[PDB]
Structures are given as structure tokens and as C-alpha cells.
Amino acid sequence: MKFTVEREHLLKPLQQVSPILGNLLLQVADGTLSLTGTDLEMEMVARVALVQPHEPGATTVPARKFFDICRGLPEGAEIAVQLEGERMLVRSGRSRFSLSTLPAADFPNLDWQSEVEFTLPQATMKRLIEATQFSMAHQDVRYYLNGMLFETEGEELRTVATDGHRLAVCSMPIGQSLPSHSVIVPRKGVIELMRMLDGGDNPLRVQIGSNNIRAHVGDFIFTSKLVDGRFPDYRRVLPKNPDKHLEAGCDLLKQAFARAAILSNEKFRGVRLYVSENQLKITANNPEQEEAEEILDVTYSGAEMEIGFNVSYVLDVLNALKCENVRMMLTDSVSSVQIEDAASQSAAYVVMPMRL
Amino acid sequence: MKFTVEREHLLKPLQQVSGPLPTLPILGNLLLQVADGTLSLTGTDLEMEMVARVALVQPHEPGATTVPARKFFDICRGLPEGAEIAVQLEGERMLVRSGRSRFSLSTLPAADFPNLDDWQSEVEFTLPQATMKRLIEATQFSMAHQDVRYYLNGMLFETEGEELRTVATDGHRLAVCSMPIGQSLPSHSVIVPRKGVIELMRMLDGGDNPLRVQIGSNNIRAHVGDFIFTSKLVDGRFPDYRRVLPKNPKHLEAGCDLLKQAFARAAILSNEKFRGVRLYVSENQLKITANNPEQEEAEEILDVTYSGAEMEIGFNVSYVLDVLNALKCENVRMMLTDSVSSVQIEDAASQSAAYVVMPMR
Numbered sequence: 019m020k021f022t023v024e025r026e027h028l029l030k031p032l033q034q035v036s037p038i039l040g041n042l043l044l045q046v047a048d049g050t051l052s053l054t055g056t057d058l059e060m061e062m063v064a065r066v067a068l069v070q071p072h073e074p075g076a077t078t079v080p081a082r083k084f085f086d087i088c089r090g091l092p093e094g095a096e097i098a099v100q101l102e103g104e105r106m107l108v109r110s111g112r113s114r115f116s117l118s119t120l121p122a123a124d125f126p127n128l129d130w131q132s133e134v135e136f137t138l139p140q141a142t143m144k145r146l147i148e149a150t151q152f153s154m155a156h157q158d159v160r161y162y163l164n165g166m167l168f169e170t171e172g173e174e175l176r177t178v179a180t181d182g183h184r185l186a187v188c189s190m191p192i193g194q195s196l197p198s199h200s201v202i203v204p205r206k207g208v209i210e211l212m213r214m215l216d217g218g219d220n221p222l223r224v225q226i227g228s229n230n231i232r233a234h235v236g237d238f239i240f241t242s243k244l245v246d247g248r249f250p251d252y253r254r255v256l257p258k259n260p261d262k263h264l265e266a267g268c269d270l271l272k273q274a275f276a277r278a279a280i281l282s283n284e285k286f287r288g289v290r291l292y293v294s295e296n297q298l299k300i301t302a303n304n305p306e307q308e309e310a311e312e313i314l315d316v317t318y319s320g321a322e323m324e325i326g327f328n329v330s331y332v333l334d335v336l337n338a339l340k341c342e343n344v345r346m347m348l349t350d351s352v353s354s355v356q357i358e359d360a361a362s363q364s365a366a367y368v369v370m371p372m373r374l
Numbered sequence: 375m376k377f378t379v380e381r382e383h384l385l386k387p388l389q390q391v392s393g394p395l396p397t398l399p400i401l402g403n404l405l406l407q408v409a410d411g412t413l414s415l416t417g418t419d420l421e422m423e424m425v426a427r428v429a430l431v432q433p434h435e436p437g438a439t440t441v442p443a444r445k446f447f448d449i450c451r452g453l454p455e456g457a458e459i460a461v462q463l464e465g466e467r468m469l470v471r472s473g474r475s476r477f478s479l480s481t482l483p484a485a486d487f488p489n490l491d492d493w494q495s496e497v498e499f500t501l502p503q504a505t506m507k508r509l510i511e512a513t514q515f516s517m518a519h520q521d522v523r524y525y526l527n528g529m530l531f532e533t534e535g536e537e538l539r540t541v542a543t544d545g546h547r548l549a550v551c552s553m554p555i556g557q558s559l560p561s562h563s564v565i566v567p568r569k570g571v572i573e574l575m576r577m578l579d580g581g582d583n584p585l586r587v588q589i590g591s592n593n594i595r596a597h598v599g600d601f602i603f604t605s606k607l608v609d610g611r612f613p614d615y616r617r618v619l620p621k622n623p624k625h626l627e628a629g630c631d632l633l634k635q636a637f638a639r640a641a642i643l644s645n646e647k648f649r650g651v652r653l654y655v656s657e658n659q660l661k662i663t664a665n666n667p668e669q670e671e672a673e674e675i676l677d678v679t680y681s682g683a684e685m686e687i688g689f690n691v692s693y694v695l696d697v698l699n700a701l702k703c704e705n706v707r708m709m710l711t712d713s714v715s716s717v718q719i720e721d722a723a724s725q726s727a728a729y730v731v732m733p734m735r
């Protein structure tokens with residue numbers, strides 16, 4: 019196995035693909051160098067064209083060491099690789115390296131069949147994930163909440179994320195008629211998928227199987243296993259009939275929350291909201307008996323009520339909305355609230371109240 | 375005690391005096407004092423203090439208290455730009471109001487705030503901020519971290535003739551830097567504690583305001599703009615850099631960045647713990663090799679200026695990298711003796727900073 023390639027062409031591929039699971043699989047075949055990283059749950063494959071003389075073959079090498087070497091070489095560098103027994107030789111200028119190898123044959127492979135396919139701007143996928151990813155659970159015993167629902171319905175792709183205390187849902191049109199379908203992508207997979215998307219205008223092809231998802235953009239192919247379990251139905255989480263409607267400036271609301279939070283309990287940070295005619299009062303207190311109060315002029319209709327919220331849950335929403343004005347739809351002091359950008363119904367958020 | 379101050383006049387003073395910040399509650403508080411038209415803010419860790427003076431152009435009333443530093447800073451920072459911050463002491467609480475935002479903070483008496491003893495300066499001088507930044511940045515990285523030999527956890531500041539000098543070492547490597555001050559000074563040699571060196575750096579804004587320094591037998595003080603920093607000194611006897619510099623060290627000269635990157639790349643395949651690289655010096659060439667127990671090998675060859683006998687010497691590549699990163703110059707001189715002796719390293723263009731790294735077996 020031999021190739022010579024510009025450092026420049028290896029950088030993004032290496033970034034994307036970065037004991038045998040600490041190794042990258044390198045394969046030369048049909049004028050192409052393919053680089054594959056895997057943790058057994060997911061895999062990333064990047065391809066680089068080879069124009070300079072090359073010889074087919076494959077090995078695996080330490081991923082971080084190999085990446086660090088290539089990134090460590092100067093800009094403009096040319097990188098020459100040859101496989102020599104149990105070692106891989108890497109050469110550029112008067113820099114030389116010999117890396118240990120494990121056989122290509124020992125490298126783990128994820129086959130499976132595609133059931134649902136569609137193309138969409140990578141930008142639309144980014145929007146969907148950014149809108150909801152912060153509401154994923156992290157290490158819940160309910161594994162299926164440690165990730166994100168991808169659902170196709172009509173001509174929309176929808177994401178849903180929840181940790182049982184707050185929920186996020188976002189839908190975007192993809193311009194073609196789709197079968198009704200839903201799968202859970204593990205949180206690590208959502209993160210890796212998001213990292214593959216750079217905000218250029220670039221089509222993304224998505225293929226979904228019974229147990230896998232695959233995404234192709236440019237010269238990259240990401241494949242992950244799915245998480246198998248029953249995801250909650252966002253439609254049963256949305257408040258069925260909120261009759262109290264609050265509208266306020268996004269930034270004013272965010273900053274009032276953040277300031278009041280300073281004097282909340284540091285271990286479980288929440289604030290009390292009192293809504294009344296034209297007005298919102300946010301309050302906090304702590305074990306030192308310190309107290310914060312914020313008063314805001316707001317658009318409000320409905321009965322006066324008091325309700326508490328976890329600060330981080332509300333700030334997380336306001337930070338995802340990046341809105342001018344936000345709508346909060348309330349029911350009563352013991353029910354969850356629905357939060358939305360006053361000027362967009364692409365996304366919605368539902369947050370449990372907190373007792374204080 | 376009462377004052378009203380615009381948000382942005384309070385923000386950097388609060389950030390600065392919080393520098394030394396907890397073991398007991400009052401140590402997480404700032405001292406606020408209104409007196410003779412000035413708000414003073416003080417934070418301390420019992421070893422050092424940072425004090426800020428902020429002038430009061432709005433109505434105020436004298437008095438003093440202490441309040442939690444982080445809460446008070448976070449409140450001020452979180453208020454809208456140009457927010458007028460009104461403060462009033464009310465016994466065991468201090469009330470903060472701006473627009474329709476209100477905060478109540480728990481106080482501890484100003485009289486219980488620890489207060490560094492009065493002391494007498496024996497030497498005083500002024501110097502540009504840029505000079506102090508250069509002295510500290512040149513040597514800070516070589517200070518020990520949590521060593522049982524406490525005096526090594528600090529930085530030696532030495533005045534001698536027309537020069538201010540810093541020295542730092544952890545027993546394994548040493549850094550020394552001297553700069554002119556255009557003023558004759560008595561001989562003093564003092565150890566500044568770890569966090570004090572950090573505070574000194576932190577107060578240098580990078581404008582044209584000079585730095586005024588005062589040193590006594592047991593204390594050091596630095597004034598910049600409207601900030602006064604004071605630290606107690608570490609009460610030990612620091613090693614003498616003069617006696618650690620190699621007696622008579624073969625001369626190698628090389629581009630700093632070419633050297634840095636070659637060491638950086640070789641280090642990738644150096645032992646994970648011991649970080650050993652081998653240097654082979656030969657006629658106008660340096661060869662750097664690293665290998666680990668996996669028997670992966672790195673080799674970098676560089677063109678350098680060298681005329682001496684060929685030799686092999688091992689180094690902790692991290693120590694060498696630290697030196698090259700602190701030098702930030704075009705060319706470096708490495709001054710060698712033999713394979714079991716330290717190397718001295720310097721900017722090829724200046725003897726103001728010198729570095730001593732011991733070889734590894």
C-alpha cells in the first residue's frame with residue numbers, strides 16, 4: 019500500500035474520522051484513499067482522490083498519532099506513505115515516522131438495507147438538530163431518551179428530543195412526499211452528524227434502515243446504529259388548551275432570568291414567575307436568605323398566576339430560539355408551558371414547572 | 375453607606391479585585407468602602423490583596439461593608455449596558471437596585487475583613503507595564519507546582535544595579551530574565567508567591583500607564599492606574615541562578631519555529647510519561663528522534679549552525695517546547711557541554727533571558 023498526497027487534502031477527512039477502535043482504516047483502491055473511523059456504534063468514511071502514483075492495499079494505524087503527525091507538518095506539505103510489514107512509514111520533507119499497524123482484516127465493519135430515503139439541504143438538517151439537541155437526555159436509564167427522534171411525515175422531516183422534564187420539537191419542509199416513519203439516533207451519533215455539516219450549500223442524502231441511519235454529504239459517509247425503544251409522542255406532551263398567553267422580548271426575558279438566577283439555590287436553580295395584567299415578576303431566593311426581583315412589561319392575557327421554572331430549561335429554549343419576541347402559552351400553576359418564537363411555528367418547546 | 379455608579383465603571387474593578395478569590399465565608403467577600411468621594415473595593419486571600427478606587431460622581435454616603443464578590447460581580451455584569459447601579463447598606467443586607475431589578479445580598483462586617491499589616495518600603499521604582507509583562511512571561515512557566523520545597527512554587531524578583539530580574543525553577547529546569555529600568559537600585563532578592571505573580575500579570579492593561587513598585591523585607595506592592603496590589607513574600611532562600619548556569623558550555627543556533635515544530639512532531643511518538651527525545655548534534659545538523667515502547671519512531675532532521683564535537687543527549691521534550699514557546703523569537707542558541715550535563719538555551723539575538731534544562735537518562 020503506497021500513496022503520496024497533499025497534507026491539505028487529508029486535513030478535513032482526518033478531522034471527521036478522528037485497541038483497534040483507536041485506529042483508522044486506510045484503504046487504497048480504484049484511485050481513491052478511504053479513511054474509516056469507528057467506535058462499533060457508528061462509523062465515518064472519508065474519501066480522497068489520488069492523482070500521484072499509488073499502490074492498492076490497506077492497513078490500520080493509530081488515529082490520533084497519524085492525525086497529529088499530518089496536522090503537525092507545515093502548510094503546503096506533501097505526505098508519502100508506504101506499508102512496510104507491521105509498520106507504516108510516513109514521510110514529508112526530512113520528517114520521518116514509523117507507526118505500528120493492526121491488520122485491515124481485523125478492522126470492525128458495521129451490512130443492512132435502506133427502507134426510507136430523501137435528500138435535503140445540509141442547512142435544513144443543521145437547523146433541525148440545533149433546534150432540539152439540547153433537550154436530549156445524557157445518561158438516562160431509559161436509553162431511548164439518550165438521543166433524538168427523526169420522523170418523516172407528509173413533506174416534512176421532524177426532530178424531537180426530551181429528557182422527561184423538557185421537550186423540543188422542530189419540523190421543516192423537504193419538498194417531496196414522504197412515508198410516515200420514525201427512528202431514534204443515539205446522542206453520540208447526533209453530535210457526530212452535526213459535526214459533519216459545515217453550512218455550505220451542499221445536498222445531504224439520508225438513508226434509514228430498521229437498525230441504522232446513513233448520511234452522505236460531499237465525500238463523507240456517516241453511518242450509525244439506531245436506539246430501539248418507544249419514544250414519547252410529542253403530540254401528547256404539547257399542552258392541549260393553554261388559555262393564558264404571555265409575549266415578551268426574548269432578550270429581556272433571558273437577561274431577567276439569568277440575573278434572578280444569581281440568587282437562586284446553586285444546586286437546583288429556579289425562579290418564581292408571577293404573571294398579571296401587562297406584567298411579569300421573576301423572583302429568586304437562596305439558603306442565605308438573599309433575594310432577587312425582576313419586573314418586566316409584557317403582553318399578557320388571562321388570569322393572574324404564579325409558577326416556577328428551572329432556569330437552565332428556560333435559558334436553553336431562549337438560546338435556541340434567538341428570537342425577537344417569545345410566546346409562552348400557560349394553563350395553570352401545575353402544568354407544563356409551551357414556548358415558541360412569536361414569529362415562527364417551525365419549532366416548539368414544552369417545559370415542566372418547578373416547585374419552589 | 376450608599377452609592378450609585380454606572381455599570382461599566384464598576385465592572386473591571388470588580389473583576390480585578392476578585393482576582394485573589396473560599397475556605398471561610400468572609401474570604402469570598404469584597405470590602406466596599408465609601409470615603410472622601412471614592413468607592414474602594416478590596417479582595418484578599420490572606421496572602422495578598424487587590425484594591426480598586428472608583429470615583430463617585432453621583433450622590434453618595436460614607437460607610438463600609440463586605441458582600442459576596444461573585445454574586446455582586448455577576449449582578450453588575452448581567453445588568454443592561456449603561457445600567458445605573460444603586461447600592462445601599464442595610465445592616466445584615468446590602469440592597470442593589472437598577473431599573474426594575476432588585477437584589478439583596480448578605481453582609482459581613484467591614485471590621486471583620488482581614489487587613490494586611492502596615493509595612494515599610496525599602497526600595498521603590500517605576501517601570502513600563504510592558505517590561506513587567508516581559509519579565510513574568512519569560513519565566514512563569516518554570517515555577518514549580520505544589521512542590522514540598524515551597525520557595526520553588528513562587529518567583530524570585532531581584533533588583534541589582536540598573537536591572538530588575540525574575541527567576542523561576544522547579545529543580546528540573548530554570549528560567550531567568552533581566553531587563554533594564556534606567557534607575558539605580560539597591561540589592562534586594564524576594565520571592566513572590568504563585569498567585570501573586572498571576573495577579574501582577576492580570577493587572578497590566580497594556581496601555582501607557584506606568585507601574586510603580588515598592589518592595590520591603592516581607593511585602594511587595596504594585597500600583598497601576600486606580601489599582602493597588604499588595605502581597606506578602608515567601609519566606610525562604612531561593613537557589614542562585616548564577617550557580618546553576620553551565621560552567622562553560624559547544625554552541626548550536628537554529629530557527630525557533632523550525633525547531634519548535636520538529637520537536638512538536640517528534641514528541642507525538644515520545645514515551646507517554648517520560649516525554650524523552652534524543653538529540654544528535656553533528657556538523658551543521660540537528661537530528662531529533664523519539665520512540666516509545668511500541669517501537670514507533672520519529673526522526674526530524676534540521677539544518678542548523680553547529681561546529682563542535684558530535685554528541686547525543688536526551689531531553690524532556692515538554693521542557694524544551696516550553697522554552698521555545700516563551701522565547702517567541704526568530705533564532706535560538708543552545709549551549710551544550712556533554713550528555714550528562716544541562717543545556718543553556720537563549721534567544722540567539724539577546725542574553726536578557728536564559729534557560730537551563732537538565733538532560734534525561
Ligand SMILES: O=[N+]([O-])c1ccc2cn[nH]c2c1
Pocket residue numbers: 180181182183184185250255354355368369370
Ligand atoms: O409534561 N411535560 O412537559 C413533559 C415533558 C417531557 C416529556 C417526555 N415524556 N413525557 C413528557 C412530559
Ligand SMILES: [Ca+2]
Pocket residue numbers: 035055056057060061062
Ligand atoms: Ca467514528
Ligand SMILES: [Ca+2]
Pocket residue numbers: 024025026093094095
Ligand atoms: Ca498543499
Ligand SMILES: [Ca+2]
Pocket residue numbers: 380456457458
Ligand atoms: Ca446610564
Ligand SMILES: [Cl-]
Pocket residue numbers: 027065066067
Ligand atoms: Cl479529493
Ligand SMILES: [Cl-]
Pocket residue numbers: 114115116671672673
Ligand atoms: Cl523512521
Ligand SMILES: [Cl-]
Pocket residue numbers: 176187188189363364365366
Ligand atoms: Cl413541529
Ligand SMILES: [Cl-]
Pocket residue numbers: 234235236237238239
Ligand atoms: Cl456518498
